[model samples]
Structures are given as C-alpha cells and as structure tokens.
Target: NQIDLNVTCRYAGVFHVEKNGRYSISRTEAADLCQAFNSTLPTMDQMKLALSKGFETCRYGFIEGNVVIPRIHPNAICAANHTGVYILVTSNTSHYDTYCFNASAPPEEDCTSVTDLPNSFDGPVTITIVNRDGTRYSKKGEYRTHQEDI
Candidate 1:
C-alpha cells in the first residue's frame, strides 16, 4: 500500500528587527522593508549582509493591492536558465531577526538535464514567514511566471 502524508502550518502577527538594531513590526515597517529589499536585490554583498542579519527572504505578493517591483536584472533568469519569485509581507519588524530563515547563500538546484525538474519546482513556490519561537506568521504562493526585458 502507498503511504500518504499531510502537512499544515499556521501563523500570527509579530515584530521584526534590522541589522542596524532598529525595530518595527507594523504595516508601515513592512512597506519600508519591501521597498528597501526590492531596490537592493541586485547586490549580492548586500543580500549576504541582510541574510546574515536575519532578513529571511524578500517576497512579492499577487494580492489585490500587493505589487511586484521588477528586479534590476529582469533578464538575468532567462540568460541563466533559471527562475525566480518575489513576495511582499506585512510583518512586525522586531520579530524578523529571531523568527526568519536566514539564507546564507544564493538559492540553487542540481539537475542533469536542462528540462530536469526538482521535486519542489514542479509547482508554485511558497514562501513562509515564521516567528522567533518557531510559529508561522504568514505565507504566500507564486507560480513560476515572467516577462521580457526592455
């Protein structure tokens, strides 16, 4: 017999903190962080610092008012034979450092063929936000989609 497993998650509102030791966990803070992360997406060094400081992942949402600001290198993925996703979050700034997954390196995949798909890439990418004590805060999903550069 085949075994089936089911998984589920939950989240709540919380605060986040920045590398500078500044804190904000409200809607306004969320907006500022989004804009800042979007603008600085191209700098790997900056990303590393942010990641080390505990900025989990920068994301963009497809909600009614949520918007995705294009990255600096819009065609970078196409040229690299890769894919990307973005998200926008409304989270507490004070809880950021303690609650998020810190990405220390660029995300990658290993496939033998160009058409090879990973176990997780066949579907939408889900970015989840968690709290300091390991509780979910929020999550958003994005299907792999895109455009051409000017």
Candidate 2:
C-alpha cells in the first residue's frame, strides 16, 4: 500500500524566514523525534522519493545521512529560484522544521496457537491470522504442533 509514503512537517510552531530567519536542529534530536514516532529522519533518497510521490512544501527541514543538512523545497522565500536542494547547516542552528514519515502498515504481529483444536486432522485445514493493522496471513496445511512457535 501507499500509506508509508506519506510525509508531514512535525514542527508545529511558527518559523519565518524573514523575521526569525532559517534555523536548524541537531541531527540527534531530529533522529530521536523520528524514532519516537517509529520512523526515521528522511534521507536524500527518501526525500527524492517523496518528491517523486508528489510531496511538496515551502519549508526547510532536516534530513539524515551525511552531515546534518537542511532540505528546502521549491519555494520563493527560502531558496528563491534555487529550491529543492539540500543545504549544509550547523548542527545547533534552530529554525528548520522536521520532516516526519507516517508509520508504515503491516507491523509484525504475534501469532499464537489456537488453544482448542481437534487432536488430529485428516485433511488440510486453513488457518487465518489477522493483525490489527489489517494484514492477514492464511495457510492451508496439515495442522501439527511443535515445541517452539513463532
């Protein structure tokens, strides 16, 4: 599914290129924020993918990989005609926004044995497992028990 390709600016405060000027944040903090949301800071490749997927914003944000860099979208105020490029910036500078990725679907789910089952089966039985994220796995085979399970 395309749910994983969504991108959004995480910083909610106001940032003005004119009044406050462009600011930057430490890569560690940006990484922490992304990890907290079960995602990672976008890399240049990821940013390019986002762009290819029709992601566009007029703000600057920090991206991972290489030295911490601020990526500016094609905007009139930020980069003028030279937008949509990554610009190197200081680690502690404080003006850029944080680009965050939405949590991808089909997170790993735990499978448990169904407690009540017939002792033996003569033919193949279909077992279906569903996860909270709407992922389903089904298998048809001779049901058997093992000492260790996933």
Top-lDDT candidate index: 2
- Compared with the true structure, all predictions reach lDDT values of 0.25, 0.39
Which tens-of-lDDT digit does each residue in 1-150 have in candidate 1? 111111111111111223223222233333333332221112334333333333332222221133222133334332132222233345333222112111322343111111101121222334333323444332233212222100
Where in model 1 is the C-alpha error above 4 Å? 1-127, 146-150
Model 1, backbone clash pairs (residues 3+ apart or across chains), number: 19
Candidate 2 lDDT, tens digit per residue, 7-54?
A: 222222111111112333344544543443455666666555555434
Q: Which residue pairs clash within candidate 2? A: 23-94, 23-95, 23-96, 24-93, 24-94, 24-95
- Cα misplacement distance, residue 4 of candidate 1 (Å): 19
- Top-TM-score candidate index: 2
Query: Least accurate stretch of 10 residues (summed lDDT) in model 2?
Result: 11-20
After aligning candidate 2 to the native by TM-score, how far in Å is the CA of 53 from where it should be?
A: 1.2
